[PDB]
């Protein structure tokens, strides 16, 4: 099966140009249409346009035609979405996808994989890495055989941070909350996990925080208070 | 452009119930030669790209459970989920690939209605590392509750707080259909050390009465 892998999250200042990359596995663009879909908060999914790299043709929706350009690097089978004159309103998750249309020449590839999404944040605020603080378990965070512990990921910009526990070994009981924008302009979130209260003296618990826009990696042991 | 109008915008249905989602196109998406409808249904779960469920109005993709069924033709389409299960929580989108521009419906949010579950309330004092800087965050966690509606109020030495806390709520859990909620009270270290009792008061349909969790600094 073909897989699409997009470039990482990105913050760009207003008025700048933005490029999102979409690497198509399989070594060929074949007859695919590479489409781009925007998911902005509160506006669902909107098709921006698509490129048929084998024919060097692209088409767009009226909403984006005058400020979007599609390209393809055939030496790397990578398609690129280029946004011009970015505005705050362009802060969105951008997906690439193999999605063609009947009226254009699909090659039969109306359905294909989707990429994982690229969060583009349009802001004048500068990139800032997280502070990671423990949420220590205690008598106030146990309920019988269940104890809760966590990590407070604070003062970062932009989104997103990723949080794993024990380097991905702990998944059951994990809740990572949506980030909230603080009065400061920076984001804060917490990640919590409920574990057996009997394991608290035996098992070590590490939250692994990744903030790629600042290339900050923090592993914090969470100990009982 | 072909405009897709989806119905409903939001849906809450119990486990084992049938969910019905509808889409109306402003123009037919039917190709007269083969009588194929160029219409698809997608499912988007939290944190993931949309996943194709149904192509050609009624063709189920591999790996999609048989509970998922698509129907209709021309301008009117329906997605039927039989015997809803916890992992069906998602936003569902219709899509037309007949004519450019490709268009999507606006999305239907599907919530699972389960039995009322009271939150387990947990509280966390600020870390001393955080206190080594000039700030102190106090976190109240409401874990694994249903329904989503809950009220969290902060009291510091019995004085109600306003404007210095923020809430975040998870998406509905795909296994137990519960929510979790964090309320964070943020104070300067200076203000945190002036007071002794930090209390989170939680009111929720599943609680015998307003429960309050606190700690003494």
Short mmCIF file of C-alpha atoms in Angstrom, two decimals:
data_model
loop_
_atom_site.label_atom_id
_atom_site.label_comp_id
_atom_site.label_asym_id
_atom_site.label_seq_id
_atom_site.Cartn_x
_atom_site.Cartn_y
_atom_site.Cartn_z
CA UNK A 1 0.00 0.00 0.00
CA UNK A 2 1.07 3.58 -0.74
CA UNK A 3 1.75 5.86 2.23
CA UNK A 4 1.97 9.66 2.40
CA UNK A 5 4.36 11.24 4.92
CA UNK A 6 4.14 15.00 5.38
CA UNK A 7 6.63 17.46 6.80
CA UNK A 8 6.47 18.60 10.39
CA UNK A 9 4.47 21.29 12.13
CA UNK A 10 5.55 24.83 11.43
CA UNK A 11 5.01 28.37 12.67
CA UNK A 12 5.24 31.17 10.12
CA UNK A 13 4.92 34.91 10.52
CA UNK A 14 2.01 36.75 8.86
CA UNK A 15 2.66 37.59 5.22
CA UNK A 16 5.29 34.88 4.77
CA UNK A 17 5.27 31.94 2.36
CA UNK A 18 4.75 28.38 3.59
CA UNK A 19 5.70 25.05 2.02
CA UNK A 20 4.28 21.71 3.20
CA UNK A 21 5.93 18.59 1.80
CA UNK A 22 4.17 15.30 1.04
CA UNK A 23 6.43 12.33 0.27
CA UNK A 24 4.59 9.66 -1.72
CA UNK A 25 5.92 6.17 -1.03
CA UNK A 26 6.24 3.71 -3.90
CA UNK A 27 8.81 5.61 -5.94
CA UNK A 28 6.41 7.03 -8.51
CA UNK A 29 3.61 9.53 -8.91
CA UNK A 30 2.09 7.04 -11.41
CA UNK A 31 -1.29 8.47 -12.50
CA UNK A 32 -2.16 9.86 -9.07
CA UNK A 33 -3.74 13.18 -8.29
CA UNK A 34 -2.14 14.59 -5.13
CA UNK A 35 -4.83 16.71 -3.46
CA UNK A 36 -4.51 19.02 -0.47
CA UNK A 37 -7.26 19.38 2.13
CA UNK A 38 -7.41 22.03 4.85
CA UNK A 39 -8.93 21.46 8.29
CA UNK A 40 -9.23 24.76 10.03
CA UNK A 41 -10.95 25.03 13.44
CA UNK A 42 -14.70 25.27 12.87
CA UNK A 43 -14.70 24.97 9.04
CA UNK A 44 -14.63 21.17 8.59
CA UNK A 45 -12.68 19.86 5.60
CA UNK A 46 -12.08 21.98 2.50
CA UNK A 47 -10.39 20.85 -0.72
CA UNK A 48 -7.77 23.38 -1.78
CA UNK A 49 -6.51 21.83 -5.01
CA UNK A 50 -4.77 18.91 -6.61
CA UNK A 51 -1.80 18.29 -8.88
CA UNK A 52 -1.33 15.51 -11.42
CA UNK A 53 2.49 15.52 -11.51
CA UNK A 54 2.71 13.12 -14.47
CA UNK A 55 0.87 15.69 -16.62
CA UNK A 56 2.15 18.86 -14.93
CA UNK A 57 -1.40 20.14 -14.41
CA UNK A 58 -3.13 21.39 -11.28
CA UNK A 59 -6.59 22.65 -10.39
CA UNK A 60 -7.88 24.63 -7.42
CA UNK A 61 -11.00 25.74 -5.66
CA UNK A 62 -11.91 29.41 -6.16
CA UNK A 63 -11.24 30.05 -2.46
CA UNK A 64 -7.52 29.23 -2.80
CA UNK A 65 -6.64 29.63 -6.51
CA UNK A 66 -5.09 33.10 -6.14
CA UNK A 67 -2.79 32.31 -3.20
CA UNK A 68 -1.86 28.61 -3.53
CA UNK A 69 0.60 26.92 -5.87
CA UNK A 70 1.25 23.22 -6.21
CA UNK A 71 4.60 21.74 -7.24
CA UNK A 72 6.22 18.31 -7.35
CA UNK A 73 9.83 17.19 -7.03
CA UNK A 74 10.11 14.18 -9.31
CA UNK A 75 13.63 13.34 -8.09
CA UNK A 76 12.15 12.56 -4.64
CA UNK A 77 8.49 11.84 -5.50
CA UNK A 78 7.56 14.66 -3.12
CA UNK A 79 4.61 16.98 -3.73
CA UNK A 80 4.57 20.46 -2.19
CA UNK A 81 1.79 22.79 -1.10
CA UNK A 82 2.81 26.43 -1.19
CA UNK A 83 0.69 29.06 0.56
CA UNK A 84 1.28 32.74 -0.18
CA UNK A 85 0.56 35.74 2.06
CA UNK A 86 -0.42 33.64 5.07
CA UNK A 87 -2.96 35.11 7.49
CA UNK A 88 -3.99 34.16 11.02
CA UNK A 89 -7.06 32.54 9.41
CA UNK A 90 -4.74 30.07 7.61
CA UNK A 91 -3.80 28.38 10.89
CA UNK A 92 -4.95 24.87 10.10
CA UNK A 93 -4.12 21.21 9.74
CA UNK A 94 -3.15 20.59 6.12
CA UNK A 95 -3.55 17.10 4.67
CA UNK A 96 -2.22 15.69 1.45
CA UNK A 97 -4.19 12.83 -0.06
CA UNK A 98 -4.49 10.79 -3.22
CA UNK A 99 -7.90 12.16 -4.26
CA UNK A 100 -8.92 12.57 -7.88
CA UNK A 101 -12.08 13.71 -9.62
CA UNK A 102 -14.13 12.31 -12.47
CA UNK A 103 -14.16 15.56 -14.50
CA UNK A 104 -10.39 15.78 -14.31
CA UNK A 105 -8.54 12.59 -15.31
CA UNK A 106 -8.39 10.47 -12.16
CA UNK A 107 -6.50 7.51 -13.50
CA UNK A 108 -9.03 5.65 -11.35
CA UNK A 109 -7.41 6.87 -8.11
CA UNK A 110 -10.33 8.61 -6.45
CA UNK A 111 -9.36 7.04 -3.14
CA UNK A 112 -5.86 6.72 -1.78
CA UNK A 113 -4.09 7.09 1.54
CA UNK A 114 -4.08 10.37 3.43
CA UNK A 115 -1.01 11.89 4.99
CA UNK A 116 -0.83 12.37 8.74
CA UNK A 117 -1.48 16.12 8.61
CA UNK A 118 0.75 19.17 9.05
CA UNK A 119 -0.22 21.82 11.58
CA UNK A 120 0.67 25.27 10.25
CA UNK A 121 0.41 28.09 12.78
CA UNK A 122 0.47 31.66 11.48
CA UNK A 123 1.67 33.97 14.24
CA UNK A 124 4.16 36.70 15.11
CA UNK A 125 4.95 34.99 18.42
CA UNK A 126 8.32 33.27 18.56
CA UNK A 127 8.93 29.56 19.04
CA UNK A 128 9.27 28.58 22.72
CA UNK A 129 9.99 25.10 24.13
CA UNK A 130 7.96 23.56 26.98
CA UNK A 131 8.60 23.52 30.70
CA UNK A 132 7.67 20.03 31.93
CA UNK A 133 6.55 19.70 35.55
CA UNK A 134 5.52 16.53 37.39
CA UNK A 135 1.99 15.91 38.64
CA UNK A 136 3.00 13.73 41.56
CA UNK A 137 0.62 11.02 42.82
CA UNK A 138 -0.43 11.18 46.46
CA UNK A 139 -3.27 10.40 48.85
CA UNK A 140 -5.20 13.15 47.01
CA UNK A 141 -4.89 11.43 43.67
CA UNK A 142 -5.72 7.83 44.60
CA UNK A 143 -9.11 6.14 44.70
CA UNK A 144 -8.52 2.71 46.18
CA UNK A 145 -6.68 0.52 43.69
CA UNK A 146 -6.49 3.41 41.19
CA UNK A 147 -3.88 6.18 41.33
CA UNK A 148 -3.47 9.11 38.94
CA UNK A 149 -0.21 10.87 38.03
CA UNK A 150 0.84 13.06 35.15
CA UNK A 151 2.91 15.82 33.61
CA UNK A 152 2.19 19.51 33.20
CA UNK A 153 3.57 20.71 29.83
CA UNK A 154 3.63 24.51 30.01
CA UNK A 155 4.80 27.75 28.27
CA UNK A 156 5.26 26.38 24.72
CA UNK A 157 4.59 27.76 21.26
CA UNK A 158 3.43 26.64 18.80
CA UNK A 159 1.37 23.49 18.84
CA UNK A 160 1.85 20.60 18.95
CA UNK A 161 3.62 18.76 21.71
CA UNK A 162 3.53 14.99 21.77
CA UNK A 163 3.48 13.12 25.07
CA UNK A 164 4.21 9.43 25.50
CA UNK A 165 4.67 7.47 28.74
CA UNK A 166 7.57 5.07 29.38
CA UNK A 167 8.61 5.68 25.75
CA UNK A 168 5.33 4.29 24.42
CA UNK A 169 5.19 1.28 26.75
CA UNK A 170 2.25 2.69 28.74
CA UNK A 171 -0.92 3.38 26.76
CA UNK A 172 -3.87 2.13 28.81
CA UNK A 173 -5.29 4.84 31.04
CA UNK A 174 -3.44 7.69 29.29
CA UNK A 175 -5.30 10.96 28.75
CA UNK A 176 -3.51 13.86 27.05
CA UNK A 177 -5.65 16.94 27.13
CA UNK A 178 -6.06 19.42 24.27
CA UNK A 179 -3.72 22.34 24.70
CA UNK A 180 -5.21 25.58 26.00
CA UNK A 181 -3.94 29.02 24.99
CA UNK A 182 -2.90 30.85 28.20
CA UNK A 183 -3.36 34.60 28.87
CA UNK A 184 0.40 34.84 28.03
CA UNK A 185 -0.05 33.74 24.40
CA UNK A 186 1.66 30.44 25.19
CA UNK A 187 0.07 26.97 25.26
CA UNK A 188 -0.27 24.63 28.24
CA UNK A 189 -1.53 21.05 28.52
CA UNK A 190 -1.42 18.19 30.98
CA UNK A 191 -1.05 14.48 30.33
CA UNK A 192 -2.40 12.13 32.97
CA UNK A 193 -2.36 8.36 33.39
CA UNK A 194 -4.21 6.13 35.86
CA UNK A 195 -2.19 3.15 37.07
CA UNK A 196 -2.54 0.57 39.85
CA UNK A 197 -1.97 2.30 43.17
CA UNK A 198 0.04 -0.75 44.27
CA UNK A 199 2.63 -0.15 41.53
CA UNK A 200 3.64 3.26 42.89
CA UNK A 201 6.65 2.03 44.85
CA UNK A 202 7.66 -0.55 42.24
CA UNK A 203 7.17 0.96 38.78
CA UNK A 204 9.03 4.00 37.45
CA UNK A 205 6.94 6.40 35.36
CA UNK A 206 8.48 8.72 32.75
CA UNK A 207 6.64 11.19 30.55
CA UNK A 208 8.37 11.77 27.21
CA UNK A 209 7.58 15.23 25.84
CA UNK A 210 8.49 16.07 22.24
CA UNK A 211 8.16 19.62 20.87
CA UNK A 212 9.61 19.43 17.38
CA UNK A 213 9.11 23.14 16.38
CA UNK A 214 11.77 23.90 19.04
CA UNK A 215 13.52 20.50 18.85
CA UNK A 216 13.05 20.15 22.62
CA UNK A 217 12.97 16.62 24.04
CA UNK A 218 12.31 16.28 27.77
CA UNK A 219 11.99 13.07 29.77
CA UNK A 220 10.76 13.68 33.32
CA UNK A 221 10.49 11.01 36.01
CA UNK A 222 7.23 11.44 37.94
CA UNK A 223 7.74 10.31 41.54
CA UNK A 224 5.29 10.10 44.46
CA UNK A 225 5.26 13.33 46.46
CA UNK B 1 -19.76 24.06 -7.02
CA UNK B 2 -21.57 20.91 -5.80
CA UNK B 3 -22.60 21.75 -2.23
CA UNK B 4 -23.05 18.83 0.19
CA UNK B 5 -25.45 19.47 3.08
CA UNK B 6 -25.05 16.86 5.83
CA UNK B 7 -27.65 15.93 8.46
CA UNK B 8 -27.52 15.97 11.42
CA UNK B 9 -24.74 18.22 12.77
CA UNK B 10 -24.47 16.24 16.01
CA UNK B 11 -25.85 12.89 17.20
CA UNK B 12 -25.90 11.10 20.56
CA UNK B 13 -26.97 7.46 20.56
CA UNK B 14 -26.61 4.56 22.96
CA UNK B 15 -24.50 1.46 22.30
CA UNK B 16 -26.44 -1.06 20.11
CA UNK B 17 -28.63 1.66 18.55
CA UNK B 18 -28.68 2.54 14.83
CA UNK B 19 -27.18 5.87 13.74
CA UNK B 20 -28.34 7.44 10.46
CA UNK B 21 -26.38 10.24 8.77
CA UNK B 22 -27.71 11.92 5.61
CA UNK B 23 -26.12 14.03 2.81
CA UNK B 24 -27.90 16.05 0.07
CA UNK B 25 -25.97 17.30 -3.02
CA UNK B 26 -27.07 20.44 -4.86
CA UNK B 27 -26.37 18.54 -8.11
CA UNK B 28 -26.51 14.88 -9.06
CA UNK B 29 -23.25 12.96 -8.71
CA UNK B 30 -24.53 10.08 -10.87
CA UNK B 31 -22.65 9.09 -14.04
CA UNK B 32 -25.35 7.97 -16.49
CA UNK B 33 -23.21 5.49 -18.46
CA UNK B 34 -22.47 2.98 -15.67
CA UNK B 35 -24.97 4.37 -13.11
CA UNK B 36 -22.21 4.82 -10.53
CA UNK B 37 -22.52 7.52 -7.86
CA UNK B 38 -19.23 9.36 -7.28
CA UNK B 39 -19.89 9.75 -3.53
CA UNK B 40 -17.95 8.58 -0.48
CA UNK B 41 -18.19 8.52 3.34
CA UNK B 42 -15.23 9.15 5.67
CA UNK B 43 -14.71 8.65 9.40
CA UNK B 44 -12.34 10.91 11.34
CA UNK B 45 -11.30 9.85 14.82
CA UNK B 46 -9.48 12.21 17.20
CA UNK B 47 -5.89 12.87 16.20
CA UNK B 48 -6.10 10.99 12.91
CA UNK B 49 -6.65 11.72 9.22
CA UNK B 50 -10.08 10.91 7.79
CA UNK B 51 -10.44 7.24 6.89
CA UNK B 52 -12.49 6.09 3.90
CA UNK B 53 -15.49 3.96 4.93
CA UNK B 54 -17.70 3.79 1.83
CA UNK B 55 -16.99 4.47 -1.84
CA UNK B 56 -19.38 4.70 -4.80
CA UNK B 57 -22.26 5.52 -2.40
CA UNK B 58 -22.58 1.92 -1.17
CA UNK B 59 -19.28 0.00 -1.54
CA UNK B 60 -17.70 -0.83 1.82
CA UNK B 61 -13.91 -0.65 2.02
CA UNK B 62 -11.87 -3.57 3.32
CA UNK B 63 -11.50 -3.67 7.08
CA UNK B 64 -14.67 -1.62 7.58
CA UNK B 65 -17.19 -3.54 9.74
CA UNK B 66 -20.44 -4.78 8.07
CA UNK B 67 -22.41 -2.55 10.55
CA UNK B 68 -21.46 0.34 8.22
CA UNK B 69 -23.78 0.71 5.23
CA UNK B 70 -24.13 3.41 2.59
CA UNK B 71 -27.14 4.00 0.37
CA UNK B 72 -28.96 6.39 -1.92
CA UNK B 73 -28.27 7.76 -5.37
CA UNK B 74 -28.13 10.97 -7.38
CA UNK B 75 -28.65 13.77 -4.82
CA UNK B 76 -29.71 11.96 -1.61
CA UNK B 77 -27.33 9.67 0.31
CA UNK B 78 -27.34 8.00 3.73
CA UNK B 79 -24.79 6.34 5.97
CA UNK B 80 -26.27 3.80 8.39
CA UNK B 81 -24.30 2.45 11.36
CA UNK B 82 -26.05 -0.62 12.78
CA UNK B 83 -25.53 -1.68 16.42
CA UNK B 84 -23.29 1.26 17.43
CA UNK B 85 -20.10 0.38 19.34
CA UNK B 86 -17.83 2.59 21.52
CA UNK B 87 -15.18 2.82 18.81
CA UNK B 88 -17.67 4.49 16.43
CA UNK B 89 -17.18 7.87 18.14
CA UNK B 90 -15.86 10.15 15.40
CA UNK B 91 -16.80 12.90 12.98
CA UNK B 92 -18.32 11.56 9.75
CA UNK B 93 -17.94 13.40 6.44
CA UNK B 94 -19.62 12.94 3.06
CA UNK B 95 -17.52 13.67 -0.04
CA UNK B 96 -18.25 14.13 -3.75
CA UNK B 97 -15.58 13.30 -6.36
CA UNK B 98 -17.76 13.77 -9.46
CA UNK B 99 -16.79 17.33 -10.38
CA UNK B 100 -14.03 19.68 -9.31
CA UNK B 101 -13.76 21.27 -6.86
CA UNK B 102 -14.04 18.24 -4.60
CA UNK B 103 -16.41 19.12 -1.77
CA UNK B 104 -17.10 17.67 1.66
CA UNK B 105 -20.12 17.84 3.91
CA UNK B 106 -19.72 19.92 7.02
CA UNK B 107 -19.30 16.92 9.31
CA UNK B 108 -21.53 14.99 11.70
CA UNK B 109 -20.22 14.52 15.23
CA UNK B 110 -21.26 11.16 16.69
CA UNK B 111 -21.34 10.84 20.48
CA UNK B 112 -21.98 7.59 22.33
CA UNK B 113 -24.61 7.86 25.05
CA UNK B 114 -23.69 5.49 27.90
CA UNK B 115 -24.86 5.19 31.48
CA UNK B 116 -24.09 8.08 33.79
CA UNK B 117 -20.64 7.70 35.36
CA UNK B 118 -19.43 9.97 38.15
CA UNK B 119 -15.89 11.34 37.88
CA UNK B 120 -13.08 10.26 40.09
CA UNK B 121 -11.73 13.60 41.31
CA UNK B 122 -7.99 14.00 41.79
CA UNK B 123 -5.97 17.06 42.76
CA UNK B 124 -2.27 17.88 42.33
CA UNK B 125 -0.29 20.59 44.15
CA UNK B 126 2.32 22.58 42.22
CA UNK B 127 5.71 21.01 41.74
CA UNK B 128 8.63 22.53 43.58
CA UNK B 129 10.43 22.93 40.23
CA UNK B 130 7.54 25.10 39.07
CA UNK B 131 7.64 26.89 42.42
CA UNK B 132 11.38 27.44 41.92
CA UNK B 133 10.16 29.78 39.22
CA UNK B 134 7.62 32.44 40.05
CA UNK B 135 4.50 30.42 39.14
CA UNK B 136 2.23 27.80 40.69
CA UNK B 137 -0.33 25.69 38.82
CA UNK B 138 -2.88 23.62 40.75
CA UNK B 139 -4.52 20.87 38.71
CA UNK B 140 -7.91 19.30 39.37
CA UNK B 141 -8.59 16.16 37.33
CA UNK B 142 -12.08 14.76 36.74
CA UNK B 143 -11.44 11.29 35.35
CA UNK B 144 -13.67 9.05 33.24
CA UNK B 145 -17.13 10.59 33.58
CA UNK B 146 -20.34 10.77 31.54
CA UNK B 147 -22.15 12.93 30.52
CA UNK B 148 -19.76 15.66 29.41
CA UNK B 149 -21.43 18.41 31.47
CA UNK B 150 -19.53 19.12 34.69
CA UNK B 151 -18.93 22.24 36.76
CA UNK B 152 -15.59 22.87 38.46
CA UNK B 153 -15.11 25.87 40.75
CA UNK B 154 -11.92 26.83 42.56
CA UNK B 155 -11.92 28.17 46.11
CA UNK B 156 -8.81 29.48 47.84
CA UNK B 157 -9.34 29.87 51.59
CA UNK B 158 -13.10 29.62 50.82
CA UNK B 159 -12.92 32.55 48.35
CA UNK B 160 -14.28 31.74 44.90
CA UNK B 161 -11.81 32.24 42.07
CA UNK B 162 -12.60 33.77 38.70
CA UNK B 163 -10.44 34.51 35.69
CA UNK B 164 -7.35 32.56 36.85
CA UNK B 165 -8.27 29.01 35.82
CA UNK B 166 -8.69 27.17 32.52
CA UNK B 167 -10.41 23.92 31.56
CA UNK B 168 -9.60 21.31 28.95
CA UNK B 169 -11.75 18.27 28.12
CA UNK B 170 -10.70 15.15 26.22
CA UNK B 171 -12.55 13.69 23.30
CA UNK B 172 -14.92 10.87 24.19
CA UNK B 173 -12.98 7.69 24.89
CA UNK B 174 -13.19 5.09 22.13
CA UNK B 175 -13.32 2.16 24.62
CA UNK B 176 -15.38 3.27 27.66
CA UNK B 177 -17.18 6.31 26.13
CA UNK B 178 -16.21 8.59 29.04
CA UNK B 179 -14.68 12.04 29.20
CA UNK B 180 -11.93 13.44 31.37
CA UNK B 181 -11.47 17.06 32.33
CA UNK B 182 -8.61 19.10 33.74
CA UNK B 183 -9.04 22.43 35.49
CA UNK B 184 -5.79 24.31 36.13
CA UNK B 185 -5.61 27.18 38.62
CA UNK B 186 -2.55 29.34 37.92
CA UNK B 187 -1.15 31.69 40.57
CA UNK B 188 2.14 33.44 41.12
CA UNK B 189 4.31 31.74 43.74
CA UNK B 190 3.86 34.86 45.89
CA UNK B 191 0.06 34.50 45.92
CA UNK B 192 0.20 30.72 46.36
CA UNK B 193 2.23 31.06 49.56
CA UNK B 194 -0.24 33.56 51.05
CA UNK B 195 -2.98 30.92 51.28
CA UNK B 196 -3.40 27.48 52.84
CA UNK B 197 -6.47 25.67 51.49
CA UNK B 198 -6.88 25.06 47.75
CA UNK B 199 -10.20 23.44 46.87
CA UNK B 200 -11.77 22.13 43.67
CA UNK B 201 -15.56 21.83 43.93
CA UNK B 202 -17.09 19.45 41.38
CA UNK B 203 -20.77 19.18 40.49
CA UNK B 204 -21.88 16.45 38.10
CA UNK B 205 -25.05 14.48 37.43
CA UNK B 206 -23.40 11.28 38.66
CA UNK B 207 -22.50 12.61 42.12
CA UNK B 208 -24.72 12.20 45.18
CA UNK B 209 -23.92 15.86 45.90
CA UNK B 210 -21.26 18.46 45.00
CA UNK B 211 -17.95 16.77 45.84
CA UNK B 212 -14.91 18.83 46.79
CA UNK B 213 -11.26 17.85 46.75
CA UNK B 214 -8.70 20.08 48.41
CA UNK B 215 -5.24 20.14 49.93
CA UNK B 216 -3.43 22.16 52.56
CA UNK B 217 -0.20 23.79 51.37
#
